[PDB]
Design a protein around this ligand. Sequence first.
Ligand SMILES: [Cl-]
Ligand SMILES: [Cl-]
Ligand SMILES: [K+]
Length: 164
Amino acid sequence: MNIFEMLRIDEGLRLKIYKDTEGYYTIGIGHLLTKSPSLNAAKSELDKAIGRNCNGVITKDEAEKLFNQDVDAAVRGILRNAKLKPVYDSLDAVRDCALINMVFQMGETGVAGFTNSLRMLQQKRWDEAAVNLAKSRWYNQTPNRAKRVITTFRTGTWDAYKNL
Ligand SMILES: [Cl-]
Ligand SMILES: [Cl-]
Ligand SMILES: [K+]
């Protein structure tokens, strides 16, 4: 189990434009295309991202390419972030995956706003952080995914992804 498998489980894989849990146009493995309500806008963004006229659909290889770029961007974003970097450096490898997952889902900005939880993670107060993390819109909107991620932070194991 590694970050790619983890996210593949949480995001799934769709080769045609679809709407994510928030109603935004997305494709592949959770690759957000646009927050705009225009499907044409999304189709444009798609073509631009892939480098060809896709007409709303892509191949598995294309999906995977986007996925690699996205994971790379999330990690890179974490490392450039003054509030995120220290936490990421302080965590073990498994727990670092949980942080990357959050950033992939909600962006650097979103995550950087979980100040209190971040501080608790930095201090390695696992149960305390887990409770704090659950007091959020994130947990209330996507509870199953949030539970998996929170369990990962709490335990430092892949148990929540075992049998999925
Ligand atoms: Cl709440
Ligand atoms: Cl969920
Ligand atoms: K680390």
